[PDB]
Amino acid sequence: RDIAKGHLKKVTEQYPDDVEAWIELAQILEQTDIQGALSAYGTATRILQEKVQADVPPEILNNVGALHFRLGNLGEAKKYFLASLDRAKAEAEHDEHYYNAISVTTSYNLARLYEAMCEFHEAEKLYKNILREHPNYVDCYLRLGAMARDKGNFYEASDWFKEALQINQDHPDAWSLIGNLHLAKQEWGPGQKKFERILKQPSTQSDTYSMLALGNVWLQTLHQPTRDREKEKRHQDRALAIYKQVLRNDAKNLYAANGIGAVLAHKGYFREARDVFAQVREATADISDVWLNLAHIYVEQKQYISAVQMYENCLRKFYKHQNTEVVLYLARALFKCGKLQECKQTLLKARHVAPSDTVLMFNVALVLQRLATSVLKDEKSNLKEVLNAVKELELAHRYFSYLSKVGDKMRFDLALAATEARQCSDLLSQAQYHVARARKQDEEERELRAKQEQEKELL
Amino acid sequence: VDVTRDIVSRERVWRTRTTILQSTGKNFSKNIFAILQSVKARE
């Protein structure tokens, strides 16, 4: 391939009637930089026109649309697929070259494009057109399944996925996607050994993707109160063994190293974690996980001013306006002023899309409690804010009452609101103390403004 | 059928699952395994 690169830039500058020279240029460029492939196709489109005004074969045009698919040029990628299908139609008699099959994969690409338009209606149309004419194909059979997976798991999503194994049980991609469905059901955690054992046949092995999935379903077992019972210690070392195995078979996997750093961070080695995550950090920043795991270390050194910025940097993806666990992992030991009131604003943003959470309404009660005790104790503060303080702690007591009546918690019962209730009662006493001080500061500001009134009369 | 081998031959895969996990740079694991052994030196 490097010698191919050398010969290709031995001939690209040349022209011994170069025709396909750009075709086999870009034919290796698809692994490499895509823009080089674009440029090769660009003059390759021209070069088929001067010797004779010959229409570009649709395999070229489909592939350049395929390039623009991973680029921002989605619309003219669609135009490329349209004119590709037309040129295949212009290959009226070419069942030797099988323009029909080329149209099949072209339509597959165009349906994948309609998915990028989020035109899932026409994506459904193209997919069912292909499957009604070539039902032996699997990728269309499961992208349809993936589309309904975006709607949900127990749809015909899961059933297209299972029948994709029924048409092809040898198919590792679909078979992986079977257990990918089961990632939604984490209560089907220990059951995933079987549904990720089926193609641990060694024809499929080695499957890095699946064995990292084993490591991941093995790590979600952690953060339980049974580590002291050596159970999660064994789980940590078993995940470590998986990670050593994927380490030896691949040094350059990055999700592996994320897994090693995660399990050792669960082992309490957080100074020993930011380094290993730093490696995958330069390797590629575009892994959503490592953004979180680094800031967990930062807040473990209480480095909030290094952490929350990178949290909202993780929020710079076009995925979800209020991801819940990220603002949870944001509001952890947040103790300064913006770490209190803007913390409340973040909790309100989360609560706006997630008013169902008991933990979130507990945590807003907690942060309201913190800001209430921040304004009534050594304060000696404004009238209006301590007037808001009594209302906000009253609200906090409403949530203390409300959550305590609820049974289910985050597997830790929140009768801890009761000591908050004794607190807020003594906070009522303190507020009745300090509101008198508020009236005192009001009357003294009245007397000093009288004192300036008299002297300005004197002037 | 003939369509299956007819399509899977003529297309190409430049983007698979497995090399997503593998990093596009060169991040070896000796440094990783060295600190793996180093934490074992604390053990």
């Binding site: 592939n63 993707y209 991941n216 952890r332 | 699952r17 997503i20």
Partner: peptide, 25 residues
């Protein structure tokens, strides 16, 4: 205050799905 905010802190790890690059004839 007396204790920090509660969380089920986990160093989770996500997986990319299958890419399905548009094909190259």
């Amino acid at each position: 205050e007396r204790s920090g905010v509660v969380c089920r802190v986990k160093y989770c790890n996500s997986l990319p799905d299958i890419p399905f690059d548009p094909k190259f004839i």
